[PDB]
């Protein structure tokens, strides 16, 4: 943390943050969500980290070079250490990236190494080659070298993500799935795990072995698992919570902007809220059905009437303000809602649905005040506009993500946030073989458009290809885009160091500080 000259620090440097739900895991290779990544950034540090404004900056690597954007060499700082005092070495990164790639680990982020094009990853994922054939090597204890199969100019931007953080081999090997318990875990970020009470709290304490420990200010941070946005706001206003999670309740938000304007932080955020359709299950394997659902949803009512938190109506998966996005707004988005409704009704009638044999399906969502109120609204809109009946089902976060990967569901509430600021952070998740593809969408035309992006060495051709890839996704109605999120959350006036400038919201508690109050 960089405390401005003249700010008076509180005697007690502790922080309580709400984190939306109970994490899936603390193992960097088993996680895929925001809550998970929030805790992961405080505990495990990769090659690079984001600075306080979100720019990729030195993490365990203090400096790096590339050769033709295909061979990347990372010089690791000599004083990087784990919490047990042992050095963090390039051997740790070699082991960790191989563990990520290995199919036996079954990471949801195994394809992150495909997104970066590390050599031999496709064969490794397919079990044709052992994980030790992965194109990574330790040239010495402080030098990690990565070899890609084609030039990737934005490669280094990927490296702040939890899936490419190191994990401690000796703890993993000795404790198996209990390696992350407080008595067993070993970490290399600014913090260490003190307590983990499922469905109550996660408490982290400063890691004195962290290389940049002298600049850490907060001594202890607690992450809570509250999925009710109303309750989070209530426990923030009671004094318990210093920073709410960044999901805001429909019940209270209008009042909050007028009651505590200065604490209501609203900033750009590279995330898209959408309804995920299970493309491999009838009747959702019919494009007419998917297009009808997409067109009949009225984004203006949802975004400006039922939610009104500053979100923008969406017509694509990749947010249009992602670095490198030059998207073409489809003609259906410019139409009136009545024109979209007739087309929707026309397509469903064409798909075989009638008043006596209507379309009836489930709308799965993770427990939340915000998601439940939006799903009830969407169910009413789809009933009014298209005559379809929806049965709402809530599931806790970890189970919800597992259900979507299991892929026998119908429609699910969804939302993807960028891992790096470039359109392929979204687009790669719709590849046929992506480990993150919970839409279960498989299009050879879409796959080809993305494969073509690194075969050109031109940003304009790349951007035109991303635009066409979005058009292909839209043409197939893989998903139902709803809105691009804003990052809205409450932050107490005494919490210093949170700029809101990072559109990825990669916060590190080592960057914050508590002002005297």
Curated annotation (Swiss-Prot):
Location in the cell: Periplasm
Disulphide bond pairs: 271-417
Further remarks about this protein from its record: Isothermal titration calorimetric measurements of the binding of lysine-containing peptides of different lengths to OppA show that the dipeptide Lys-Lys is bound with 60-fold lower affinity than related tri- and tetrapeptides (Lys-Lys-Lys and Lys-Lys-Lys-Ala, respectively).
GO MF term list: peptide transmembrane transporter activity
Phenotypic consequence of gene deletion: Mutant cannot take up cell wall peptides.
Subunit structure: The complex is composed of two ATP-binding proteins (OppD and OppF), two transmembrane proteins (OppB and OppC) and a solute-binding protein (OppA).
Keywords: Disulfide bond, Peptide transport, Periplasm, Protein transport, Signal, Transport
Function text: Part of the ABC transporter complex OppABCDF involved in the uptake of oligopeptides, including the cell wall murein tripeptide L-alanyl-gamma-D-glutamyl-meso-diaminopimelate. Plays an important nutritional role and is involved in the recycling of cell wall peptides. Binds peptides containing from two to five amino acid residues regardless of their sequence. Also binds cell wall peptides, such as L-alanyl-gamma-D-glutamyl-meso-diaminopimelate.
SUPFAM superfamilies according to UniProt: Periplasmic binding protein-like II (SSF53850)
GO biological process, one term: peptide transport
NCBIfam families assigned: PRK15104.1
Protein name as annotated: Periplasmic oligopeptide-binding protein OppA
Description of its domains: Accommodates the ligand side chains in large hydrated pockets which impose little specificity on binding. Tight binding is achieved by utilising the hydrogen-bonding potential of the main chain of the ligand.
Keyword Transport among record annotations: yes
InterPro entries assigned: Peptide/Ni-bd, SBP_5, SBP_5_CS, SBP_5_dom
The family this protein is said to belong to: Belongs to the bacterial solute-binding protein 5 family.
Source domain of life: Bacteria
Induction, per UniProt: Part of the opp operon, which is constitutively expressed.
GO CC, one annotated term: outer membrane-bounded periplasmic space
Organism in which the protein naturally occurs: Salmonella typhimurium (strain LT2 / SGSC1412 / ATCC 700720)
């Amino acid at each position: 943390a960089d405390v401005p000259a003249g700010v008076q620090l509180a005697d007690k440097q502790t922080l309580v943050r709400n984190n939306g739900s109970e994490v899936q895991s603390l193992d960097p290779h088993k996680i895929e969500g925001v809550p998970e990544s929030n805790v992961s950034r405080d505990l495990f540090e990769g090659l690079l980290i984001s600075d306080v404004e979100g720019h990729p900056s030195p993490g365990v690597a203090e400096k790096w070079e590339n050769k033709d954007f295909k061979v990347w060499t990372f010089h690791l700082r000599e004083n990087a250490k784990w919490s047990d005092g042992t050095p963090v070495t390039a051997h740790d990164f070699v082991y960790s990236w191989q563990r990520l790639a290995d199919p036996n680990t079954a990471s949801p982020y195994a394809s992150y190494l495909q997104y970066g094009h590390i050599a031999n990853i496709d064969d490794i994922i397919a079990g044709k080659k052992p994980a030790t054939d992965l194109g990574v090597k330790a040239l010495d204890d402080h030098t990690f070298e990565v070899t890609l199969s084609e030039p990737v100019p934005y490669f280094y931007k990927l490296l702040v993500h939890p899936s490419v953080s190191p994990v401690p081999k000796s703890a993993v090997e000795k404790f198996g799935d209990k390696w992350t318990q407080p008595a067993n875990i070993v970490t290399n970020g600014a913090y260490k795990l003190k307590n983990w009470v499922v469905n109550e709290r996660i408490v982290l304490e400063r890691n004195p072995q962290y290389w940049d420990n002298a600049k850490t200010v907060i001594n202890q941070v607690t992450y809570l698992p509250i999925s009710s946005e109303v309750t989070d706001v209530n426990r923030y206003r009671s004094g318990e919570i210093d920073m709410t999670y960044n999901n805001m309740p429909i019940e209270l938000f209008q009042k909050l902007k007028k009651e505590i304007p200065n604490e209501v932080r609203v900033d750009p955020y590279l995330c898209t809220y959408y309804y995920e359709i299970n493309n491999q299950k009838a009747p959702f394997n019919d494009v007419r059905v998917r297009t009808a659902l997409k067109l009949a949803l009225d984004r203006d009512i949802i975004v400006n009437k039922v939610k009104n938190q500053g979100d923008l109506p969406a017509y694509s998966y990749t947010p249009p303000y992602t670095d490198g996005a030059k998207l073409v707004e489809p003609e259906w988005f410019k139409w009136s809602q009545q024109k979209r409704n007739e087309e929707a009704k026309k397509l469903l009638a064409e798909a075989g649905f009638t008043a006596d044999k209507p379309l009836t399906f489930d709308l799965l969502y993770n427990t939340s005040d915000l998601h439940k109120k939006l799903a009830i609204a969407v169910a009413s809109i789809w009933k009014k506009n298209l005559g379809v009946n929806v049965n709402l089902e809530n599931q806790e976060w970890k189970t919800f993500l597992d259900t979507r990967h299991q892929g026998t569901f119908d429609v699910a509430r969804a939302g993807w946030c960028a891992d790096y600021n470039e359109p392929t952070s979204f687009l790669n998740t719709m590849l046929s073989d992506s480990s993150n593809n919970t839409a279960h969408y498989k299009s050879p035309a879409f796959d080809k458009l993305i494969a073509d992006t690194l075969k050109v060495a031109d940003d304009t051709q790349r951007s035109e290809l991303y635009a066409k890839a979005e058009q292909q996704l839209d043409k197939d109605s893989a998903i139902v885009p709803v809105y691009y999120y804003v990052n809205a959350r409450l932050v107490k006036p005494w919490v210093g160091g949170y700029t809101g400038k990072d559109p990825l919201d990669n916060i590190y508690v080592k960057n914050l500080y508590i002002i005297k109050h």
